[PDB]
């Protein structure tokens, strides 16, 4: 293996491989996260290239524990590695403290793992950005993590293709008094903007987090919500 | 424990009892000591249960992988050799004696005995276990060449029952298996059907 | 569009548009072979069909094949570089055996697919090795939801399908099967798709067929007589 | 242009240039001749001096009681290989208590030398060797190249301007198997003299001889001890 | 200690006592010895308490990871495999004896695991110090394909015999019923023993104790 | 860019050639061997009167019967000198006898080419060993390429060519140690830029029956009186 | 035995909205006294304490490692520790040294920093938690303390009666132990204050 | 510069270092191997570059195992390395499983070892091709060919070296599936004599060996007298 760093400083002080990884991320499928008073909603677009594909073979929304969930934007193969490591870290924390890991601690550990690949020998940075949702101490959380290793706490956010317009949409139509169902309606509407084709229950994925835990909605419920809208 | 295997023209007959004790207390009385390593290869186990079970699992894994690579059914001699290598490598730790018996198209029905120490040898009939010291004269006197398949099940049942009556560590039911080309035939002799 | 900088075409690092060129070249490494394979699944069976080429008369045709057996219930079709394909098959066999040893029961098809794709993803991050130039198709039977067809590509991506094709004529076969799907005899569909895309009527010795069935879960390879009977049925119907 | 800096790069014509440069290193050493009869093996070496105030460099080394070698090329590599050979012979005599056959030693040398020519950031051994030995099958002369390839010879010359000696040996091969020790030594001296410039001659200062035989351990003659062999020449 | 398990026509019944001693003095009177491993798999432990606790926690975490990756309910054979392999790796220095049980897509399964890595698959099992007194009851009164209530009564009788006939066992009885459609965790099921009522009044009136120094730290 | 272990088209290692180039920038050392002993003489490059001459040592004692004179990159010779001392002491410990000058030279020169990618480059220092053993006085020369030879009179350093040319006519086999000292001093005076004044030179001898000896100021004055 | 080399006695008792923890004050080497004011109860928070009994070197080592870990935890998390989490942390720390164990047996007593609900528990040599509702004891005089507490403890004790009960139990228990005693220190942990007292005991 | 490392794909999906390695095999002298009804026969033309070398120098036929023989072409040092690897693999198999390694297994293991060198920049691919021949009473006669890229195949008759095409054209005319080893021994020598080019490659020597049931399953060098008989037949056919 190569023992030298492949990421180095530019004469203007920029780390360029990180910029290229962000360029890779900005070309992925859209994702939306909204935090309400009762829980968090994550939505993503799941358009596929052909009808021969099995729509239920792989999922973008995945549970880390009983109360934490992930979505991503970027490259799928890197997302799988990150998901595996996040699950292992949560299990280690549980083994030590006999208590479920809080969201803000999992985000920190995952961010440190993502940063290790920027200052290590012979490897390239991850090309994915992550949205994490959780429920702790009777209140919800929503975090974002970048390929560089920096994380932020948001109320509503959009990522992927055409995310500036998504952020403007969320800014104009967000207030702190939303219930979870109004949040789901707003998330689906935000995904509707800049969508290609006619959307059904088979080409979007939704996940919710509240007091009972994290769960991904079944296609029947997505059909109900789409009919309502 | 009393285990035994007998060769006949076209296959092998394996027999065992079903008692496992811990001191003078019978922890289990319906134990199954005949384990299939492959489709037509079996082992009978005596000694520490942990050691024999772990070694049988390891050899099952290795033999299955070898068979998948070679695209052929394995030989009895191969499995005997794998058992021999593991038993000899760790002879200061394991306490296990084994009888290997099977049928392969190249050489027919064969039986090997791997005692404590990792030795390996082929025999026409092979007995093993703690209770086998009481049936050496019987099997020496009664065995003859040219036995049929049905004359080897009766001989096995008689020898095992005689070992069961006199040993304190042997008892329960008698489990028999006949291995030949067509397949494996398994049966159990309960209390009424055990010879008296 | 198409810009580059640094060593981004010689190792696996990002280009100014977030692309990995050395992974895009490994996909063209597949088409160098010049063969095409199809895989179809029905209500109770799964079938894999491959093209068999014997360019030399002195070659032993028994040793020239692209159908392998991973476990007694799983079957494989490999396309691309031959040595890479042998390496991937010999790795998958070991992974399946270790899963069975460790967890006490037979590996599912999708978990084996996951493990292979996880292995393949590493080569696109570490810069001291290159990706393998091959694509894998797996078929099996799972006792709860029936036949399973899965595909892996050298980028680390894996998926499950109703019908798929790999090789040089992948694009044409995709449109053919899309039209056909937009089954009890899937073998006829696979053979006619291959014939249509290749513009050749096949002799019994020019293709290989492997199947798994709900009633016969074990992976088996049809002989030349059965393929000939199927081809005669194609000709008559 | 770009195919000649590493030992792990193939030229478009299917050649490795670093091996060829290591070959070029050998052809700049002083000449050495080796030849054998039915009963003896002989090595003759020509030594060089930097100036009239410096002693001539050694070129014949002891490897074992029945094996000796002669060198052409880099000196430190020769010392490394000689120590490896001595250790192998000692190990064989310790374990089996009999002398190591010469061919089995040459196989070991080739196996050791091939490894550097395949890995990144390593270099071939830039030394060529002539090996004279005797065992149960009679005399043996072996010749070794930096490319890990070895040859078994009837007679052989290595070093700078060694083509003339090779031509002389090719002309006179037929008499070698019947010659006794003195005639074989004189033949080797004539072949070595064929490489000298017309203004120089052989002398007791720049000539070294090494002989091994059926009932004779490997012996080295230098300085005045080579006077009897030079007497009667020409 | 006394731990028992039985297989009936629809599932598993497991039972244990609640006394924990240190030498010949009762340390804990409400110990818990039935451990969660999976929503369909449970374990009863005997021997050294710390070893059983850590072993079960480790195996539970590993099964959680495996089930998250595959997406299916785990199997009892998997947990049995990992337990027996880990126990054999340590050559018998982990004094844990385990009764493992669960229901999966194949049906009810019940195993017994020993400190050296042995394993038995049986229709009824007992372990502990009072294992013989309960095995007597199982040998006397067991029939195949019982109902739920009959199996619960049988397990209660076995545990009660172990409590009353052995010095290292006592206090209450805990039951866990695993079925294909449900899971019952009765805690406690029976209270065979009660503490006698105090006759005197030994309350210490204020000012009985003499004090040298005193300081107050207002938080 | 190229590695440390690449051959040139005419079969030479580049790094050894560059180290040999670096040798020719050091001060001039001259050693003479006679049947009565061996003598070593070396320069000193005093770059300022504020420096202390006695802090410059280019002639060291490997052992009571072996001395060394060095030139080239001076800081690199410390490792070689340390190893030489250690090997001589190890030989005495194991065999209870004094090492030979040739054996010391082999042991030191076995470290010459032990570098790669531990050392990363050759040494670039040239050494003259002078000793007395069972065979008598002996003078050895060792260079960065790993080759060592035995000499009768040698000159190393920046002015090696003219010094060797003069030694060609001066030397003869029957010289006395006193004549050798005078001749070496005359050659050093010829090749130096400054004036020889018993402060910018260093001189040592090894003779049978007595240990390695370093000349002091008074002896230097007495000998230079004749020149 | 190794646990009796230095001696020692510690206990914890639960009241109504309050807890009490007591320990003896003596450091000696077998049958010889060295000092009196030896510390065995350490604070691990605003309303949380841990008491160590056993071998003095292991007492001090365990206390210092536990403070190390607790400080790092509180710096990362940004909140106060909970009694369950502290018990699990101590069990992990003790089990890590299986086959080489520390010779101590801790006792933990505190209030929930969110609801102020009492918590008392005790761990064994190799870290097996054992949570009770009435009282926990540890040390060389465990039998005497069990006897006294089974008879004196009653549910729903206010701070005054709890203080009297624990004082009497500890005094009468350590009066019958040769290598424990010579002073008793009592901490009463309550919602809004902590009270530390030293009792008058026999010094022989 | 896509052709400097073995871990770089060309913009069209090729690894040029392996092709440059095969160009080294393409410059070597031809060796052929013929499988017949009851054995396998190997034949090599060994060029002599001087009259000073002894007869039997630079052997290109190796005995990998009692029942397994090998014939190489290309760089000789790489071939002599691979022979040692194959010897170790066969020995390890006999020590684990107690019986002789099947040829189809040894071929696969050696092929995987060879392919392991075409993935990294820290090593270079082998520049040698070779043939493995065996005969077993259970498995019949078997012939396998291995490639610097790592590909292994089974053949009825194969040729490797500079004269592959002419040798294959001559082998295709034999109908070898119905005749024994004695006829094949003459046929291989004949093919070798007609494919040689004596005006550019001035001198050469013929080397032959077989494995079969006439040797009771042992790989051997052809006895001398049979070799001179075959040489005389080939020369009179060439006339």
Curated annotation (Swiss-Prot), chain A:
Q: Keywords of this protein's UniProt record, alphabetized?
A: Acetylation, Cytoplasm, Nucleus, Phosphoprotein, Proteasome
An example GO biological process term is:
proteasome-mediated ubiquitin-dependent protein catabolic process
Has keyword Transmembrane?
no
Q: What happens when you mutate residue 106 to V?
A: In a colorectal cancer sample; somatic mutation
Specify where it is mainly localized: cytoplasm
- Which residues are annotated as modified residue N6-acetyllysine in the UniProt record? 66, 167
Q: What induces it?
A: Down-regulated by antioxidants BO-653 and probucol. Down-regulated in response to enterovirus 71 (EV71) infection (at protein level).
Explain the post-translational modification.
Phosphorylated on tyrosine residues; which may be important for nuclear import.
Q: Where in the cell is it found?
A: Cytoplasm; Nucleus
The family database entries (InterPro entries) matched by this protein are listed as: Ntn_hydrolases_N, Proteasome_alpha, Proteasome_alpha-type, Proteasome_asu_N, Proteasome_sua/b
Tell me which residues bear Phosphotyrosine: 2, 20, 72, 117
Q: Which residues carry this modification: Phosphoserine?
A: 3, 10, 12
- List, alphabetically, the Pfam families matched: Proteasome, Proteasome_A_N
Gene Ontology CC annotation, any one: cytoplasm
Q: Which family does it belong to?
A: Belongs to the peptidase T1A family.
> What function is annotated for this protein?
Component of the 20S core proteasome complex involved in the proteolytic degradation of most intracellular proteins. This complex plays numerous essential roles within the cell by associating with different regulatory particles. Associated with two 19S regulatory particles, forms the 26S proteasome and thus participates in the ATP-dependent degradation of ubiquitinated proteins.
The name this protein goes by in its record:
Proteasome subunit alpha type-2
Q: What is the lineage of its organism?
A: Eukaryota, Metazoa, Chordata, Craniata, Vertebrata
UniProtKB/Swiss-Prot annotation, chain D:
Can you supply a Gene Ontology BP term from the record?
negative regulation of inflammatory response to antigenic stimulus
Inducing or repressing factors = Induced in breast cancer tissue (at protein level). Up-regulated in liver tumor tissues.
Q: Which Pfam families does UniProt cross-reference here?
A: Proteasome, Proteasome_A_N
Q: Which coarse location class applies to the principal site listed for this UniProt protein?
A: cytoplasm
Q: Which UniProt keywords apply?
A: Acetylation, Cytoplasm, Glycoprotein, Immunity, Isopeptide bond, Nucleus, Phosphoprotein, Proteasome, Ubl conjugation
Q: Which GO terms describe its cellular component?
A: centrosome; cytoplasm; cytosol; extracellular exosome; nucleoplasm; nucleus; proteasome complex; proteasome core complex
Q: Where is this cross-link: Glycyl lysine isopeptide (Lys-Gly) (interchain with G-Cter in ubiquitin)?
A: 112, 205
Q: Select a single GO molecular function from the record's annotations and give it.
A: lipopolysaccharide binding
Asked whether the UniProt record includes Nuclease among its keywords, one would answer: no
Entry's PROSITE patterns?
Answer: PROTEASOME_ALPHA_1 (PS00388), PROTEASOME_ALPHA_2 (PS51475)
* Lineage top rank: taxon: Eukaryota
The record's comment on protein family reads: Belongs to the peptidase T1A family.
Quaternary structure (record) = The 26S proteasome consists of a 20S proteasome core and two 19S regulatory subunits. The 20S proteasome core is a barrel-shaped complex made of 28 subunits that are arranged in four stacked rings. The two outer rings are each formed by seven alpha subunits, and the two inner rings are formed by seven beta subunits. The proteolytic activity is exerted by three beta-subunits PSMB5, PSMB6 and PSMB7. Interacts with NOTCH3. Interacts with ZFAND1.
> What is the protein name for this chain?
Proteasome subunit alpha type-1
- Species, as recorded: Homo sapiens (Human)
From Swiss-Prot, chain E:
Subunit composition and interactions? The 26S proteasome consists of a 20S proteasome core and two 19S regulatory subunits. The 20S proteasome core is a barrel-shaped complex made of 28 subunits that are arranged in four stacked rings. The two outer rings are each formed by seven alpha subunits, and the two inner rings are formed by seven beta subunits. The proteolytic activity is exerted by three beta-subunits PSMB5, PSMB6 and PSMB7.
What protein is this chain from? Answer: Proteasome subunit beta type-7
Describe which stretch of the whole protein the shown chain covers, with first residue, last residue and complete length: 44 to 262 of 277
The residues responsible for catalysis, as annotated, are: 1
The record lists the catalysed reaction(s) as: Cleavage of peptide bonds with very broad specificity
Domain of life of the organism in this record? Eukaryota
Q: What is its EC number?
A: 3.4.25.1
This protein's GO cellular component annotations are: cilium; cytoplasm; cytosol; extracellular region; ficolin-1-rich granule lumen; nuclear body; nucleoplasm; nucleus
Q: Which family does it belong to?
A: Belongs to the peptidase T1B family.
Give the UniProt tissue specificity note.
Answer: Expressed at a low level in colonic mucosa. Up-regulated in colorectal cancer tissues.
Function statement: Component of the 20S core proteasome complex involved in the proteolytic degradation of most intracellular proteins. This complex plays numerous essential roles within the cell by associating with different regulatory particles. Associated with two 19S regulatory particles, forms the 26S proteasome and thus participates in the ATP-dependent degradation of ubiquitinated proteins.
- Name any Gene Ontology BP term: proteasome-mediated ubiquitin-dependent protein catabolic process
From Swiss-Prot, chain G:
Record's signal peptide = none
Residues recorded as bearing N6-acetyllysine in the entry: 76
Record flagged with keyword Cytoplasm: yes
Query: Which of UniProt's keywords are assigned here?
Result: Acetylation, Cytoplasm, Host-virus interaction, Nucleus, Proteasome
Its GO CC terms are: cytoplasm; cytosol; extracellular exosome; nucleoplasm; nucleus; proteasome complex; proteasome core complex; proteasome core complex, beta-subunit complex
Which residues get modified to N-acetylserine? 1
- Do you know which PROSITE patterns this protein is assigned to? PROTEASOME_BETA_1, PROTEASOME_BETA_2
Q: Does the keyword Nucleus apply?
A: yes
Q: Which GO terms describe its biological process?
A: proteasome-mediated ubiquitin-dependent protein catabolic process
Q: What induces it?
A: Up-regulated in asthenozoospermic sperm.
User: Where would you find this protein in the cell?
Assistant: Cytoplasm; Nucleus
What are the transmembrane regions?
none
Quaternary data: The 26S proteasome consists of a 20S proteasome core and two 19S regulatory subunits. The 20S proteasome core is a barrel-shaped complex made of 28 subunits that are arranged in four stacked rings. The two outer rings are each formed by seven alpha subunits, and the two inner rings are formed by seven beta subunits. The proteolytic activity is exerted by three beta-subunits PSMB5, PSMB6 and PSMB7.
The record's function comment reads: Non-catalytic component of the 20S core proteasome complex involved in the proteolytic degradation of most intracellular proteins. This complex plays numerous essential roles within the cell by associating with different regulatory particles. Associated with two 19S regulatory particles, forms the 26S proteasome and thus participates in the ATP-dependent degradation of ubiquitinated proteins.
Similarity remark: Belongs to the peptidase T1B family.
């Amino acid at each position: 293996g190569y023992s030298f760093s492949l990421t180095t400083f530019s004469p203007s002080g920029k780390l360029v491989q990180i910029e290229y990884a962000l360029a890779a991320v900005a070309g992925g499928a859209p994702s939306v996260g909204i935090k309400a008073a009762n829980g968090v909603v994550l939505a993503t677009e799941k358009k596929q290239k052909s009808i021969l594909y099995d729509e239920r073979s792989v999922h973008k929304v995945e549970p880390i524990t009983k109360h934490i969930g992930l979505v991503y934007s970027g490259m799928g193969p890197d997302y799988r590695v990150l998901v595996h490591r996040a699950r292992k870290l949560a299990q280690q924390y549980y083994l030590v403290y006999q208590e479920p890991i809080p969201t803000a601690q999992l985000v920190q550990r995952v961010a440190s793992v993502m940063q290790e690949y920027t200052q290590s020998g012979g490897v390239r940075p991850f090309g994915v950005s992550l949205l994490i949702c959780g429920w702790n101490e009777g209140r919800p959380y929503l975090f974002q993590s970048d390929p560089s290793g920096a994380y932020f706490a948001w109320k509503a956010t959009a990522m992927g293709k055409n995310y500036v317009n998504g952020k403007t949409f969320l800014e104009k139509r967000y207030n702190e008094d939303l219930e979870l169902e109004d949040a789901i309606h707003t998330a689906i509407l935000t995904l509707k903007e800049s969508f290609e084709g006619q959307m059904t229950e088979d080409n979007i994925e939704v996940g919710i987090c509240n007091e009972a835990g994290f769960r991904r909605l079944t296609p029947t419920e997505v059909k109900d919500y789409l009919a309502a809208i | 424990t009393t285990i035994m295997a007998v060769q006949f023209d076209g296959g092998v007959v394996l027999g065992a009892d079903s008692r496992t004790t811990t001191g003078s207390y019978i922890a289990n009385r319906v134990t199954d000591k005949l384990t299939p390593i492959h489709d037509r290869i079996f082992c009978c186990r005596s000694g520490s249960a942990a050691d024999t079970q772990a070694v049988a699992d390891a050899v099952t894994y290795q033999l299955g992988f070898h068979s998948i690579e070679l695209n052929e059914p394995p030989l009895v001699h191969t499995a005997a050799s794998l058992f021999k290598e593991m038993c000899y490598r760790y002879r200061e730790d394991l306490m296990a004696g084994i009888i290997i018996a099977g049928w392969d198209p190249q050489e027919g029905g064969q039986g090997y005995s791997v005692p404590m120490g990792g030795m390996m040898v082929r025999q026409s009939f092979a007995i093993g276990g703690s209770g086998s010291s009481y049936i050496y004269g019987y099997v020496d006197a009664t065995y003859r060449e040219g036995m049929t398949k049905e004359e080897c099940l009766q001989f096995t049942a008689n020898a095992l029952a005689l070992a069961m009556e006199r040993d304190g560590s042997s008892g329960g039911v008698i489990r028999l298996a006949a291995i030949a080309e067509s397949g494996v035939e398994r049966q159990v002799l309960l209390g009424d059907q055990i010879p008296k | 569009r198409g810009s580059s900088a640094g060593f981004d075409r010689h190792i696996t690092i990002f280009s100014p548009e977030g692309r990995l060129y050395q992974v895009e070249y490994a996909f063209k490494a597949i088409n160098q072979g010049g063969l095409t394979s199809v895989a179809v699944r029905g209500k109770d069976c799964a079938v894999i069909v491959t093209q068999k080429k014997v360019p030399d008369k002195l070659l032993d045709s028994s040793t020239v094949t692209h159908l392998f057996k991973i476990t007694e219930n799983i079957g494989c079709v490999m396309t691309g570089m031959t040595a890479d394909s042998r390496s991937q098959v010999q790795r998958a066999r070991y992974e399946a055996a270790n899963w069975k040893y460790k967890y006490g029961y037979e590996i599912p098809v999708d978990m084996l697919c996951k493990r292979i794709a996880d292995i393949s993803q590493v080569y696109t991050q570490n810069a001291e090795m290159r990706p393998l130039g091959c694509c894998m198709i797996l078929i099996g039977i799972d006792e709860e939801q029936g036949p399973q067809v899965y595909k892996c590509d050298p980028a680390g991506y894996y998926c499950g399908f109703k019908a798929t094709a790999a090789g040089v004529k992948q694009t044409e076969s995709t449109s053919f099967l899309e039209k056909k799907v937009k089954f009890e005899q899937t073998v006829e569909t696979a053979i006619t798709c291959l014939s249509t895309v290749l513009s050749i009527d096949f002799k019994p010795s020019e293709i290989e067929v492997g199947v798994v069935t709900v009633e016969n879960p074990k992976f088996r390879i049809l002989t030349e007589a059965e393929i000939d009977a199927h081809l005669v049925a194609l000709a008559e119907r | 242009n770009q195919y000649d800096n590493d030992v792990t790069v193939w030229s478009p014509q299917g050649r490795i240039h670093q091996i060829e440069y290591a070959m070029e290193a050998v052809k700049q050493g002083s000449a050495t001749v080796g030849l054998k009869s039915k009963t003896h093996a002989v090595l003759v070496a020509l030594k060089r001096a930097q100036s009239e105030l410096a002693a001539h460099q050694k070129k014949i080394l002891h490897v074992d009681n029945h094996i000796g070698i002669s060198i052409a090329g880099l000196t430190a590599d020769a010392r490394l290989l000689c120590n490896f050979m001595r250790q192998e012979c000692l190990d064989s005599r310790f374990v089996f208590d009999r002398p190591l056959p010469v061919s089995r030693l040459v196989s070991l040398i080739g196996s050791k030398t091939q490894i550097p020519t395949q890995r990144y950031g390593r270099r071939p051994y830039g030394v060529g060797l002539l090996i004279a030995g005797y065992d149960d099958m009679g005399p043996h002369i072996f010749q070794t190249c930096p490319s890990a390839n070895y040859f078994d010879c009837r007679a052989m010359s290595i070093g700078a301007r060694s083509q003339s000696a090779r031509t002389y040996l090719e002309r006179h091969m037929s008499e070698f198997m019947e010659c006794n020790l003195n005639e074989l030594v004189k033949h080797g001296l004539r072949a070595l003299r064929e490489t000298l410039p017309a203004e120089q001659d052989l002398t007791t200062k720049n000539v070294s001889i090494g002989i091994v035989g059926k009932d004779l351990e490997f012996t080295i003659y230098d300085d005045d001890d080579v006077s009897p062999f030079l007497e009667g020449l020409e | 200690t006394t731990i028992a398990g039985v297989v009936y026509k629809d599932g598993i019944v497991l039972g244990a006592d609640t006394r924990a001693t240190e030498g010949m003095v009762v340390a804990d009177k409400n110990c818990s010895k039935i451990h969660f491993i999976s929503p369909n798999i449970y374990c009863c432990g005997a021997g050294t308490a710390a070893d059983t606790d850590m072993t079960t926690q480790l195996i539970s975490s590993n099964l959680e990871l495996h089930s998250l990756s595959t997406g299916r309910l785990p199997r009892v054979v998997t947990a049995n495999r990992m337990l027996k392999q880990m126990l054999f790796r340590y050559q018998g220095y982990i004094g844990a004896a385990l009764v493992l049980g669960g229901v999966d897509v194949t049906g009810p399964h019940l195993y017994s695991i020993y400190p050296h890595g042995s394993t038995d698959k049986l229709p009824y099992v007992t372990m502990g110090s009072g294992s013989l007194a309960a095995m007597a009851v199982f040998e006397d009164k067991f029939r195949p394909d019982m109902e739920e209530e009959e199996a619960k009564n049988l397990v209660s009788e076995a545990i009660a015999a172990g409590i009353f006939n052995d010095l290292g066992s006592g206090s209450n009885i805990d039951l866990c019923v695993i079925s294909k459609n449900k899971l019952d965790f009765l805690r406690p099921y029976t209270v065979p023993n009660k503490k006698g009522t105090r006759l005197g009044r030994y309350r210490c009136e204020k000012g009985t104790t003499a004090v040298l120094t005193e300081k107050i730290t207002p938080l | 860019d190229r590695g440390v272990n690449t051959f040139s088209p005419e079969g030479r290692l580049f790094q050894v050639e560059y180290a040999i180039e670096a040798i020719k920038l050091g001060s001039t050392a001259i050693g003479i061997q006679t049947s009565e002993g061996v003598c070593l003489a070396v320069e000193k490059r005093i770059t300022s009167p504020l420096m202390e001459p006695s802090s410059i040592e280019k002639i060291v004692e490997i052992d009571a019967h072996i001395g060394c004179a060095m030139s080239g990159l001076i800081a690199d010779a410390k490792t070689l000198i340390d190893k030489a001392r250690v090997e001589t002491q190890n030989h005495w410990f194991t065999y209870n006898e004094t090492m030979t000058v040739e054996s010391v030279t082999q042991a030191v020169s076995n470290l010459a080419l032990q570098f790669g990618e531990a050392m990363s480059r050759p040494f670039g220092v040239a050494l003259l060993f002078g000793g007395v053993d069972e065979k008598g006085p002996q003078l050895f020369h060792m260079d960065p390429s790993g080759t060592f030879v035995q000499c009768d009179a040698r000159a190393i350093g920046s002015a090696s060519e003219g010094a060797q040319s003069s030694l060609q006519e001066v030397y003869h086999k029957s010289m006395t140690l006193k004549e050798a000292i005078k001749s070496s001093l005359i050659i050093l005076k010829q090749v130096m830029e400054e004036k020889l004044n018993a402060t910018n030179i260093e001189l040592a001898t090894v003779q049978p029956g007595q240990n390695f000896h370093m000349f002091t100021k008074e002896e230097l004055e007495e000998v230079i009186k004749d020149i | 035995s190794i646990m009796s080399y230095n001696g020692g006695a510690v206990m914890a008792m639960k009241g109504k909205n309050c807890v009490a923890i007591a320990a003896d004050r003596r450091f000696g080497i077998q049958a010889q006294m060295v000092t009196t004011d030896f510390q065995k109860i350490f604070p691990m928070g605003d309303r949380l304490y841990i008491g160590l009994a056993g071998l003095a070197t292991d007492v001090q080592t365990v206390a210092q490692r536990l403070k190390f870990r607790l400080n790092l935890y509180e710096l990362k998390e940004g909140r106060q520790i909970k009694p369950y989490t502290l018990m699990s942390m101590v069990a992990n720390l003790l089990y890590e040294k299986r086959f080489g164990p520390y010779y101590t047996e801790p006792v933990i007593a505190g209030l929930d920093p969110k609801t102020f609900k009492p918590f008392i528990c005790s761990l064994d040599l190799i870290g097996c938690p054992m949570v009770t509702d009435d009282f926990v004891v540890s040390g060389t005089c465990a039998e005497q303390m069990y006897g006294m507490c089974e008879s004196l403890w009653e549910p729903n004790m206010d701070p005054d009666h709890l203080f009297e009960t624990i004082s009497q139990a500890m005094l009468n228990a350590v009066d019958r132990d040769a290598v424990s005693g010579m002073g008793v220190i009592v901490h009463i942990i309550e919602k809004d204050k902590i009270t530390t007292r030293t009792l008058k005991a026999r010094m022989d | 510069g896509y052709d400097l490392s073995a871990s770089t794909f060309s913009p069209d999906g090729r690894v040029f270092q392996v092709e440059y390695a095969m160009k080294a095999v393409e410059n070597s002298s031809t060796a052929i191997g013929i499988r017949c009804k009851d054995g396998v026969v190997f034949g090599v033309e060994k060029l002599v570059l001087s009259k000073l070398y002894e007869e039997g120098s630079n052997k290109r036929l190796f005995n990998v195992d009692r029942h397994v023989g090998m014939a190489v072409a290309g760089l000789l040092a790489d071939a002599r390395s691979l022979a040692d690897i194959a010897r170790e693999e066969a020995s390890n198999f006999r020590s684990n499983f107690g019986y002789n390694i099947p040829l189809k297994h040894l071929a696969d293991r050696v092929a995987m070892y060879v392919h392991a060198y075409t993935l990294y920049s820290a090593v270079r691919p082998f520049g040698c091709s070779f043939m493995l021949g065996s005969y077993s009473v259970n498995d019949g006669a078997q012939l396998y060919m291995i490639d610097p890229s790592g590909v292994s195949y089974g053949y009825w008759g194969c040729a490797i070296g500079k004269a592959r095409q002419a040798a294959k054209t001559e082998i295709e005319k034999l109908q070898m599936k119905e005749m024994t080893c004695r006829d094949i021994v003459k046929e291989v020598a004949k093919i070798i004599y007609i494919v040689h080019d004596e005006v550019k490659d001035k001198a050469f020597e013929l080397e032959l060996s077989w494995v079969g049931e006439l040797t009771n399953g042992r790989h051997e060098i052809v006895p001398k007298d049979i070799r001179e008989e075959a040489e005389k037949y080939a020369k009179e056919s060439l006339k």
